[PDB]
């Protein structure tokens, strides 16, 4: 069980760690988060009490280094940093635990939610979507735009999601125009899975990462990417059976975790009604269809 210490908490802030959150008062004696489960990526995220504008945060994996948070009064935010001196770090953490100035990652033993939301998400792939190679962790916030969003303006601060565009030459084989537009199996299986992602685990990892950035930061381009990756599968007549079964599980847990009051902005009526009721896969997403109909029947 790993630890992310905080140097201090000089400004009042709501802190998130994965799907949990807690409020820290201005200059409260808060020195970090302990008992973080090893084996998963994690996200630590922030919303200041004064400025609910810009939710922001850091994706990290404690197996990749010793990370801590320190407020920067010049740039005005909580920054993640790596401590290279492992003895200084253990010594800092042990002192903060002894004084009981850390919150415990509050995982219920029965609870597989975080695993289910991050099953295919890998830190190495996050770092290729969020390019900042000198750090082992990745910063995301509400305002960052995606590469595809930038084609329709700072490239260093972008989300380099895989570009999906259903009316593109990559998507449409000359001479198969109607066939490939109405049945996107070629684009899914040959172009994206075999060609770009290599396997469905990498495809699912990017889909899960896009959803989580949409949910935790309200990142609009992430929401677009999540829905595009769902729609590409649902609009394919030919999809491996294991992928459909896994997609149903992925979406089920995403819909289960979504805040009920954000469903209006985070769910695209057209994609979901098409996927659940008109698409080739209308009858392949039993768990997802059942939770959608019981939790968000208005959208449909």
């Amino acid at each position: 069980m790993n630890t992310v210490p905080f140097t201090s908490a000089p400004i009042e802030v709501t802190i998130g760690i994965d799907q949990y959150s807690f409020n820290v008062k201005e200059n409260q004696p808060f020195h970090g988060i302990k008992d973080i489960p090893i084996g998963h990526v994690h996200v630590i995220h922030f919303q200041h009490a004064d400025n609910s504008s810009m939710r922001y945060g850091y994706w990290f994996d404690c197996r990749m280094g010793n990370f801590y948070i320190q407020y920067d009064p010049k740039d005005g935010l909580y920054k993640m940093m790596e401590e290279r001196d492992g003895a200084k770090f253990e010594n800092i953490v042990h002192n903060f635990k002894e004084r009981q100035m850390m919150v415990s990652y509050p995982k219920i033993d029965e609870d597989d939610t975080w695993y289910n939301l991050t099953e295919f998400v890998q830190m190495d792939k996050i770092r290729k979507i969020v390019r900042k190679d000198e750090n082992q962790f990745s910063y995301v916030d509400s305002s960052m735009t995606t590469v595809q969003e930038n084609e329709l303006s700072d490239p260093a601060h972008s989300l380099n999601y895989t570009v999906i565009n259903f009316k593109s030459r990559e998507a449409i084989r000359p001479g198969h125009e109607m066939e490939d537009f109405l049945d996107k199996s070629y684009y899914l299986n040959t172009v994206m899975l075999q060609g770009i992602f290599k396997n469905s685990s990498n495809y699912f990892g990017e889909l899960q990462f896009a959803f989580l950035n949409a949910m935790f930061f309200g990142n609009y381009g992430s929401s677009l990417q999540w829905h595009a990756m769902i729609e590409l599968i649902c609009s394919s007549a030919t999809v491996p059976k294991h992928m459909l079964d896994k997609l149903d599980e992925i979406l089920y847990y995403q819909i289960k975790t979504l805040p009920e009051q954000y469903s209006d902005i985070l769910l695209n009526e057209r994609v979901w009604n098409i996927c659940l009721y008109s698409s080739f896969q209308k009858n392949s997403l039993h768990n997802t269809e059942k939770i959608m109909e019981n939790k968000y029947p208005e959208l449909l």
Binding site: K167, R169, I172
Partner: protein, 237 residues
């Protein structure tokens, strides 16, 4: 964006553009079977592709053999239309290719856009106008060549005959729109108006009668009379 009353003059500027109407591509008669069920029989159709500035009409005849063994023909018809328009564009010299294509029905937008991905600089546009091009098959010479075709065929016409020698393309399009609106609302009456006087003939190389300027004013008035009536005869007014 969409073409409407507000940007109507753009049709007659010097940027090449084509209207595409697909309403006569897939045509059927519905009939009873011996078992008392209903069946369709396709008949020949056509794509109506028109330059409104010059009057040049590219009439692609759609022979019934293109539907043999195919499913979901109304959907296929839109994609066949887009395939043929795309082939037409590629067949034209670069300097004759259109800068915009305006489809008369919004369901043609995605089929045409996908078939024209190679031409990112050709704008595909809908329109808010309820243009009467479906009545093109009420023009006798056009209906004749479509129904006689035994194979796919492209036939070229000037739908304005020689009018542009005497009137502008704005006026030519207004005249065409009045004639087509008449024919669509009451074909028999419209055709009686156009042919009643046996001394005014249709030249072999024309589609419409050889009206003098004064006779066109009378004709157009009579077409204006027909349309407003039928609009009463319909709504009782």
């Amino acid at each position: 964006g969409a073409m409407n009353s507000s940007n109507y003059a753009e049709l007659f500027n010097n940027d090449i553009k084509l209207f595409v109407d697909d309403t006569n591509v897939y045509r059927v008669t519905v009939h009873k079977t011996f078992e008392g069920n209903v069946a369709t029989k396709a008949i020949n159709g056509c794509i109506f592709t028109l330059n409104p500035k010059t009057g040049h009409l590219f009439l692609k005849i759609i022979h019934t053999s293109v539907w043999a063994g195919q499913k979901r023909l109304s959907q296929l018809a839109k994609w066949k239309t887009a395939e043929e328009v795309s082939a037409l564009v590629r067949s034209l010299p670069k300097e004759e290719q259109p800068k915009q294509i305006i489809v008369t029905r919004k369901a043609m937008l995605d089929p045409l856009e996908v078939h024209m991905l190679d031409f990112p600089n050709i704008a595909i546009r809908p329109t808010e106008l309820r243009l009467p091009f479906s009545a093109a098959m009420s023009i006798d010479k056009l209906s004749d060549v479509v129904m006689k075709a035994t194979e796919p065929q492209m036939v070229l016409f000037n739908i304005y005959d020689d009018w542009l020698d005497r009137i502008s393309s704005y006026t030519a399009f207004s005249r065409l729109t009045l004639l087509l609106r008449a024919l669509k609302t009451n074909e028999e009456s419209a055709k009686m108006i156009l042919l009643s006087d046996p001394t005014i003939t249709i030249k072999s190389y024309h589609l419409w009668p050889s009206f003098t300027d004064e006779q066109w004013i009378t004709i157009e008035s009579q077409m204006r009379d027909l349309i407003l009536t039928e609009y009463g005869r319909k709504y009782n007014v």
